[PDB]
Structure 1
Amino acid sequence: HWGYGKHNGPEHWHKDFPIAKGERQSPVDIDTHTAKYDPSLKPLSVSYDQATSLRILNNGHAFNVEFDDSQDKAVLKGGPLDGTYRLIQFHFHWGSLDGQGSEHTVDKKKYAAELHLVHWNTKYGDFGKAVQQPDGLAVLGIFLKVGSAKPGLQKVVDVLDSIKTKGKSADFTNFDPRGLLPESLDYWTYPGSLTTPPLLECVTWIVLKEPISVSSEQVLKFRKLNFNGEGEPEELMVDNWRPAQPLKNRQIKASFK
């Protein structure tokens, strides 16, 4: 099926998922000098105090840290968002080298990786219904650069050896996602899509201006994961990112000057 290789990567997705060439595809390049400051944007409200993590899974494309979203335990509100969006999972996209890995770019600059905290609009009842709406999801994107280690990420790094291959999962309770955020919540926002098939155009993207720093040792462990399943020929899980897509008829707004 779809992947990130030469024969099943981003260049091939449109054949099975024609929306890949759609009206509001993601990611995109954020031209900082074209984005418009919007003084009407309310402050971003990240409420992860009651977040309940449950499990970490290698799905063959990346690894997902899943949360209990049966209640408003961990939510994202404010900013360009109307209503309440519940955290369901987070995952990353990274490269084979420190010079690439992020999906969104800033003035064409590629970061080592990108963290995506996925939330769905509670007005729609469940995640499956939400992805069918233009304002169904809100994904908080955070860039990762290589420098000093991120203490709040180590717990994630330590468990990767237990989910090396596709289909593997491990219990991952009591993890605090607040430890993955930068100091500032300044952000850019625009209407987009899921960056992986089915590429549904149901996402309000909120990309933070300030990247978080992770150590070389931490990202190296991400690169030891496998796209393949147990017993199969090893395919290192690297460069699982979709390149920037045409902005087309869209405007990127900034929460800061």
Structure 2
Amino acid sequence: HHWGYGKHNGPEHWHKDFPIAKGERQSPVDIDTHTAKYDPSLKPLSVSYDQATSLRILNNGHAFNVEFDDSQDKAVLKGGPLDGTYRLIQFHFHWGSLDGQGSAHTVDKKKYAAELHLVHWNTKYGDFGKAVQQPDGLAVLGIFLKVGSAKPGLQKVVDVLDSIKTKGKSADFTNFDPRGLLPESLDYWTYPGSLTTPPLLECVTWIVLKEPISVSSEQVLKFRKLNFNGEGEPEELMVDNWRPAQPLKNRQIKASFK
């Protein structure tokens, strides 16, 4: 029927509604660290989030999105493998039912507890909906989360979850600073790919940071308390909302470091 993460509508089924699921530049992938090519021509990333304006947090039935005002160049990504400026539109996570799984990307087959996606769209295309139709329309920064110490900067997000527990719910979420979610180092791997959830459009330049951030066990526990279902529908915990690794096919993963 309609896509999700269960046994009957899970990733294995998406191709029937989204044929691009078996495309040539699908994501996520396993990052083989000994095959990735160091490319010294890649520039350091440039993250400009000082003027970021968060607006709202929404449970869309597959994850929770924090949305930003993208009507101007307030929170932008540039540099790295990118040509042009990409504006931040939303961030969201992928996580597991257990600490040993949850990330979309894997590193030498290692799965992390979660993966943060900061989604950016290429301003040359004028709006997000036009950008998804272009091979270089989106830039997604991916950050792995491992369970260890708490991440102070994530607590504001953890605390509002109770208020968007079910699908369709939203809450005002102003003045959140996404800079509190970055690791210390901006070293990354990059490859051409796609969105990891339907519509799976192949319009993404992935920028995967090498350094994971730490979250506490309690923090991740609160994610697992969200629901996939809408209010007054049988309870389905929002867990394991990650697509498994796809074939690399004819692609090369470049590294910004050695």
Deviation at 1:35, TM superposition (A): 0.2
Alignment deviations for residues 7-52 of structure 1 (CA, whole Å, 9 cap, x no partner): 0010000000000000100000000000000000011000000000
Deviation at 1:121, TM superposition (A): 0.2
Is it true that 1:32 corresponds to 2:16 in the alignment?
Answer: no
Q: How far apart, CA to CA, are the structure 1 residues paired with 2:210 and 2:43? A: 16
Q: How far apart, CA to CA, are the structure 1 residues paired with 2:197 and 2:148? A: 28
User: Does the residue aligned with 1:93 lie in a helix, a strand or coil?
Assistant: strand
Deviation at 1:216, TM superposition (A): 0.1
Q: How far apart, CA to CA, are the structure 2 residues paired with 1:31 and 1:42? A: 21
- Sequence identity percentage: 100
Deviation at 1:182, TM superposition (A): 0.2
Deviation at 1:133, TM superposition (A): 0.1
Deviation at 1:83, TM superposition (A): 0.3
Q: How far apart, CA to CA, are the structure 2 residues paired with 1:163 and 1:124? A: 32
Alignment deviations for residues 185-215 of structure 1 (CA, whole Å, 9 cap, x no partner): 0000000000000100000000000000000
Q: How far apart, CA to CA, are the structure 1 residues paired with 2:50 and 2:218? A: 29
Q: How far apart, CA to CA, are the structure 2 residues paired with 1:42 and 1:105? A: 24
Q: How far apart, CA to CA, are the structure 2 residues paired with 1:168 and 1:72? A: 28
Deviation at 1:90, TM superposition (A): 0.1
Where structure 1 has 5 or more consecutive residues not aligned to the other structure, the ranges are none
Deviation at 1:89, TM superposition (A): 0.2
Q: How far apart, CA to CA, are the structure 1 residues paired with 2:9 and 2:170? A: 25
Deviation at 1:53, TM superposition (A): 0.1
- Runs of 4+ aligned residues of structure 1 deviating over 4 Å after TM superposition are none
Q: How far apart, CA to CA, are the structure 2 residues paired with 1:119 and 1:197? A: 17
Alignment deviations for residues 151-206 of structure 1 (CA, whole Å, 9 cap, x no partner): 00000000000000000000000000000000000000000000000100000000
Q: How far apart, CA to CA, are the structure 2 residues paired with 1:34 and 1:180? A: 28
Aligned residue pairs, count: 257
2:77 is matched with: 76
User: Does the residue aligned with 1:12 lie in a helix, a strand or coil?
Assistant: helix
TM-score by length of 2: 0.99
User: Does the residue aligned with 2:145 lie in a helix, a strand or coil?
Assistant: strand
Alignment deviations for residues 56-109 of structure 1 (CA, whole Å, 9 cap, x no partner): 000000000000000000000000000000000000000000000000000000
2:21 is matched with: 20
User: Does the residue aligned with 2:65 lie in a helix, a strand or coil?
Assistant: strand
Deviation at 1:223, TM superposition (A): 0.1
RMSD: 0.2
Deviation at 1:120, TM superposition (A): 0.2
